[PDB]
Amino acid sequence: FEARQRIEEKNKESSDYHAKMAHIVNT
Amino acid sequence: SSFEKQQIEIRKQIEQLENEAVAEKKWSLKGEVKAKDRPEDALLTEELE
Amino acid sequence: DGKRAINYQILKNKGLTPKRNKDNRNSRVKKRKKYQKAQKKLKSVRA
Amino acid sequence: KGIVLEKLGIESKQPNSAIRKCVRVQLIKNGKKVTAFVPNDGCLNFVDENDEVLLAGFGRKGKAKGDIPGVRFKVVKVSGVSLLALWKEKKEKPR
Amino acid sequence: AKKKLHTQGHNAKAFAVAAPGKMARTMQRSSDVNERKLHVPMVDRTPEDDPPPFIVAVVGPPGTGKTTLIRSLVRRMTKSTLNDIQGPITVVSGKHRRLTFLECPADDLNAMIDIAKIADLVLLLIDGNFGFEMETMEFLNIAQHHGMPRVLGVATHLDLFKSQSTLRASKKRLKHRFWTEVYQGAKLFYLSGVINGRYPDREILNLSRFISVMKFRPLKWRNEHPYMLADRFTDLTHPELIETQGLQIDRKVAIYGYLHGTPLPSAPGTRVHIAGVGDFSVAQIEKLPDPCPTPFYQQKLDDFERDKDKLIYAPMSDVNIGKLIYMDNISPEECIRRWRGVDLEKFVPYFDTFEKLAKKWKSVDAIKERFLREMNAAKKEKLRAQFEIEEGENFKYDTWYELQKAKISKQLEINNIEYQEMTPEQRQRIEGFKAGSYVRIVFEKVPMEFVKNFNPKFPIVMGGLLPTEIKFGIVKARLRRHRWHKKILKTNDPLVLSLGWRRFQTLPIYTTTDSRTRTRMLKYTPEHTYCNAAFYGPLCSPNTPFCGVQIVANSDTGNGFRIAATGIVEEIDVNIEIVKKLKLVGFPYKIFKNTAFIKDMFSSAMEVARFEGAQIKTVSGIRGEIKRALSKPEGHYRAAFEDKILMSDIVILRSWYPVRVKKFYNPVTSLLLKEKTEWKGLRLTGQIRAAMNLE
Amino acid sequence: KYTTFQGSQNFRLRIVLATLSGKPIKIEKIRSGDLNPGLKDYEVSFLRLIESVTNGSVIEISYTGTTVIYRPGIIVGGASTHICPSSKPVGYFVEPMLYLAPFSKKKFSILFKGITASHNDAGIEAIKWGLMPVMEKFGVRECALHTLKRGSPPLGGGEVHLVVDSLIAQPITMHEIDRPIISSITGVAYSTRVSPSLVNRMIDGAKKVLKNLQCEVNITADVWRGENSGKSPGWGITLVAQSKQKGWSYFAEDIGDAGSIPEELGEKVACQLLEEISKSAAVGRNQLPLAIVYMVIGKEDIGRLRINKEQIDERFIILLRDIKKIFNTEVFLKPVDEADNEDMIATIKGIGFTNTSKKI
Amino acid sequence: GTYRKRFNEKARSGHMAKLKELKRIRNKQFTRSKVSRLKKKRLDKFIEHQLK
RNA sequence: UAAUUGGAAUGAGUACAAUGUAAAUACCUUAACGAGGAACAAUUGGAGGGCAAGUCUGGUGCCAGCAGCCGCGGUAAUUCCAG
């Protein structure tokens, strides 16, 4: 159960990361 | 007194935080927690990610 | 005496300087210790 | 002189990068908002928001590996005191 | 260039400058001077009519002598030599100006921190012979973080120096040193001697004139919080209450002072904080005529009717629908019946029946007011009127700062024409005791310690607490070791800090962010930069700067610097999950190629099963996972790495254990204490070990 | 537990004004003279809504159900889904959120599920064209209210989605001392599970009554069919008069009845529009408590608002007697100088109000 | 720069009157705000449109 | 190039005196004082690497990338890539 949490949040905190980075670079 | 009654229970509280900084820290608050340092079968109860 | 004194740190106010030589302090020495160092090289390039 | 609107690139992982150093300052005489490097990332601790900064020209001679072209400006003084005076612990930031 | 210029209606070429050089060189210099003039826009909120006395607070080392310095300034402004000055004193220095002096104690940081939040103007005297002591430097650092007052330093002991050449060099050093602490171009006045018990008139006259044109700027904290300085202290209790209850009572206390900053609301029951006593609340608000009235102000009062001897005030020292609405005895049924002569839970208000409305609204001619040669003219006029209605907002300065400043200035006199109509009765309640109204506000539940141990020499202020500020949540602040202070700050080690109007020690915790994925606590402070921190205590607004100290007891100072931690607050909640890293170490006792059996990290075979699939790593830097609990010994487990682990190698499993914030809170209660120096709170971790002789 | 209110009147209003102030209240003797005394089900359901958006609030109900204790916490918010009970419509739950909408720690992304219209409480169209425009004037710019599924009594099954993204520090100080001039009359006629012809019939009745007035009259004809239309059939119309120059909107609404004439209801609401406008000055009678609050919780400054005495009823005074018991703010009322009407200017010094919760 | 915008018009009022006579005599041979102006252009167009 | 050493020198400053000056001050003179890094404590910009039981991002193992004032303990605590 903790595997499915530790994986899923870490995927969200990278999938939210590249969006927040690429929104900086184009602006 | 009114203020003195607050300062007594502060002085009651001030010793306990002093008598915790003296003390040995909890098994989990250390690093390199070897399985003989922590109590046997205590890892499941704590629950960490 | 009761009167509190300035610390040498807060007097000169030099914070976080990297370590330096003793030989930047007197330019006529660094000219001397360069030429005396650059005369050893001259014995090594030519004879 | 300009007003610190917000601090760009706080969320950058890689410390002392080029994305990290950027603050977005609006000029006071025009209201045009513009980005400016604040040199040596540990400096970013000194600027907060609404902090009256002097902008200068950045004006690099040759490009680096990770630089961001279009960062025209660099920040020199903040609340009247120099960042390089702050970074060397000479003066302190007035409020 | 021939046709580009002619495109504009006026000849482009005809308008030119005789000199390119002068026009261009002057243009850049003038622009730099302007840009310099521009500053971010603020609000004053101090009245044009009745301004309060700008509080000026002499500070400095005690052996120099500031009492004799304030006696040589009030004797040249009111021509009335005083004696044994104690407490705050108000003197009229001008036709509209009247400053209020306030001798700080030099020995007490508990009052030195207290005064810098309220001092409008601070006079700092540094001994010429001894330069700057620690107390001056400590006061300057605390004042800057809270909000910089206008500083006018002075330099006593100038007379002593044997050689003028050495004296001139010393003056330049102090002048240059003063520029770095304050703003360059600011010169501290020098006083040659105190032979007659007062300074020379010529030096004092320049100092008095220089202070008069100070024109102090508006501090951010002072225009958000209603504050006041207590002029005279009064207890209002029956001695029969004292004789019966036997000195145990909390005393009903009336206090007197000038309000400042923002209007303190006149409905009794706002909570308001004595600096150094605790959170109180107001009980009764009354306004009495100010003792010191400016001569211009007195002339106006005399004219309406149709005090020269006393020019100073030192009390501590010895010589309608709406009034039908706001009643509660009237029912709202009766309110409208008194005005002509229902639950809010339903949203649609009460109409009449469609039978009654359709007969009423046959004609729309009642509501037609709200819609959109002589004859011709009329028509034209009508059209014009409609054009203004159709395009008025779109149709209706050179510098943006000047404009957005008009958003404040037009907002000022639209209070003033509003307050003027009210003014005798409605304005006072709406006014809510505006700044400089010398108010008599009384208290209750002030402790017995405050009236017994009182001396007028220390000040007492009020902070009108915002409803934000009244609670107690853990705050997210960020702070650093103040770089004068030698040792670094420790996590979970008590620190007296002045946050808002309150001074208190709490137990902070110093919490970095591991590249913004969590809040990991450190154990110490990053010794040259801001670290994100957290501490229990009272709540405040974000972007509030505080300035926290170590031991504030004057019995235990030494020669170290007292101010240790400065910073602002980021946000506030009631719960921050806060993480200490712990790692579980283990050792392999049987390796293979690419698969290890690791012992003594987990105690039971069931404990392993709570942790399987965990990304184990080693010292050497190879990764892996732990897969199955080995059975026949109770503790061990098989784990597949990426490459062959050694025997000499130490596996570590990263993990996170949440911690808490210890909810200790302790207002300093400095002037409730008898001695009023040497208030001793919670000891440091190092100090307790020495007392208990532990290692 | 220090401010005490009597009676179940304006119950969702009193929780709002305690929450923004942070002053704890205790509302006792709620419906004590009933065969089923105490709270209703939805009033309990509304107290679950304030708990979901505010961390730290303590809510206590006595075991007779007539005494409710509420020490307010700070507005956190975030995103969540509230289930609305079938007694009261989803719109009724939405109105209290708008008052605390610009002040939360995060964005309000609150999903409402239930019945979406009734006789008493606000329809979705009324909130979108009435409450939202008032919020925009103060300074709540990026505020919205989306419709996913539209419901109707008695089963409903409809969904709206409150999304508020402007998180401002205070409402700006409004000055409206001019009666706004109505430019256009715009209304939306909706219907679920029933004939498209009825919606057309409703539009014909409203236009005929409003034909005499000279202004552009456009009623959007919105027809809903399928699963999106909702579990139970029904219809309604909402009409909105608006002024382009000052962005002021006036409205009136009603829904269809069990057997109603759609020619009559289209004629009725347009009469209820003009009756509302005839009593109005710069607001409506159902937009006025949203704007009275925003002058109070606006910053420490005098606002002005031109209001009319026909708006001033028994209900309006109970609004101003709930504010004085919490915020202690007298609302000064001066006559206007125009001798043709009895308008009065409502001037309020706003209490100095901030965002406790927003991060910097 | 005979004609300019002075810091204070009232101080130079006597000079401005004197300057006007010189400017009129020199420019006599030939003879022998915008936002308000925009409304004026709009109003004329609107009046012409209504008449049409 | 030196991780023990050796005595010499000098004014920056402090200062009798004389000189200076209208009188002072400084300079020019000159008694007595005044140099070993822990001073009597050179700066202001620049090029380049290295470190953690640190963090983050990507990846066809153990790598590549960004980077790192943050580690586990600890601030009277550490002597620490001597800094």
Chain G CB contacts of E387 below 8 Å: 39, 42-43, 46
Distances (CA, A) of C47 to C32, C42, C43, E305, E320: 22, 8, 6, 111, 114
What's the Rg (C-alpha) of chain A?
A: 12
Would you say E119 and E89 are in contact if contact means Cβ atoms under 8 Å apart?
no
Q: How far is CA E284 from CA E232, E447, F329, in A?
A: 16, 18, 18
Domains in chain F with CATH codes: 1-177+275-355 (3.65.10.20), 178-274 (3.30.360.20)
Rounded Cα gap, residues A24 and A11, in angstroms: 20
Give E101 CA → H11 C1' in Å.
Answer: 49
Optimal mutation site among E584, E688, E693, interface B, most CBs of chain B within 10 A: E584
Identity (one letter) of the amino acid at E478?
R
Question: What is chain E's length?
Answer: 695
Resolution in A: 4.9
Cβ atoms within 10 Å of D60's Cβ, excluding its own: 12
Angle, helices F11-21 vs F41-53, to 10°: value is 20
**Contact flag C4-E127 (C-beta cutoff 8 Å):** no
Our answer on whether B and E touch (3+ beta-carbon pairs < 8 Å) is yes
SS (H, E, C) chain F: CCEEEECCCCHHHHHHHHHHHCCCEEEECCCCCCCCCCCCHHHHHHHHHHHHHEECCEEEECCCCCCEEEECCEECCCEEEEECCCCCCHHHHHHHHHHHHHHCCCCEEEEEEECCCCCCCCCHHHHHHHHHHHHHHHCCCCEEEEEEECCCCCCCCEEEEEEECCCCCCCCCCEECCCCCECEEEEEEEEECCCHHHHHHHHHHHHHHHCCCCCEEEEEECCECCHHHCCCCEEEEEEEEEECCCCEEEEEEEECCCCCCHHHHHHHHHHHHHHHHHCCCCCCCCCHHHHHHHHHCCCCCEEEEEEECCCCCHHHHHHHHHHCCCCCCCCEEEECCCCCCCEEEEEEECCCCCCCCCCC
CA E483 to C1' H41, in angstroms, rounded, equals: 20
Q: Is E62 annotated as a binding residue?
A: yes
Sign of CA dihedral E553, E554, E559, E562: positive
F136 CA: distance to closest CA in chain E (Å): 16
Count CB neighbours of F121 within 10 A. Answer: 22
Closest CA to E482 of E561, E578, E390: E561
For chain A, which residues lie within 8 Å of any Cβ of chain D, measuring from their own Cβ? Answer: 17, 20-21, 24-25
The rounded distance, in Å, linking the Cα atoms of B31 and B28 is 7
Residue with tokens 């010189």: G22
Chain H positions with an atom below 7 A of a protein C-beta are 1, 13-16, 24-27, 37, 39, 41-46, 53-59, 61-63, 65-77, 83
Cβ-defined contact of E383 to G39 (cutoff 8 Å): no
Terminal Cα distance for chain F, rounded: 32
- Other beta carbons less than 10 A from residue E352's beta carbon: 11
Whether the link from the prior residue into E200 is cis, omega within 30° of 0, is: no
Residues with Cβ within 8 Å of residue F236, at least 6 apart in sequence:
F117, F123, F125, F189, F190, F191, F253, F254, F255, F256, F265
DSSP for E407-427, please give it: HHHHHHHHHHHHHHHHTTTHH
Q: Which residue of E has its CA nearest to A6?
A: E614
Query: What range defines the domain where residue D45 resides?
Result: 1-95
- Contact with chain C for residue D88, Cβ under 8 A: yes
Closest Cα partner for E153 from E172, E130, E174, E129?
A: E174
Residues 6+ apart with CB under 8 A from E437: E50, E258, E259, E287, E431
Beta bridge partners of F6: F28
Mark yes or no for CB contact D45/E529 under 8 Å: yes
E65 to chain C, any CB pair closer than 8 A? The answer is: no
Tokens linked to F84: 């609305």
Cβ atoms of F101 and F140 closer than 8 Å: yes
- Burial class for E488, CB neighbours closer than 10 Å (0-12, 13-18, 19+): middle
Q: Which residues of B touch E248 (CB under 8 A)?
A: 1
Select from E643, E657, E660, E517 the least CA-distant residue to E584. E657
Token pair 């109005």 is found at F280
* Phi and psi torsions of E504, nearest 5°: -165, 155
Residues 236..275 of F with a Cβ closer than 8 Å to E: which? 244-246, 252-254, 264, 267-268, 271-272, 274-275
- Using the CA of E480, which nucleotide's C1' is the nearest one? H69
Edge-to-edge strand list for the sheet holding F248-255: F216-221, F184-192, F234-243, F248-255
Q: Is E621 helix (H, G, I), strand (E, B) or coil?
A: coil
Residue whose tokens read 């021509």: E79
**Chain E interface mutation, best of F183, F211, F271, highest count of E Cβ atoms under 10 Å:** F271
Sign of CA dihedral F89, F90, F93, F94: negative
Binding site annotation covers E244? no
Total of domains in chain D? 1
Phi, psi for residue E26 in degrees, rounded to 5: -65, -35
Pick from G35, G38, G43: which is nearest to E384 by CB? G43
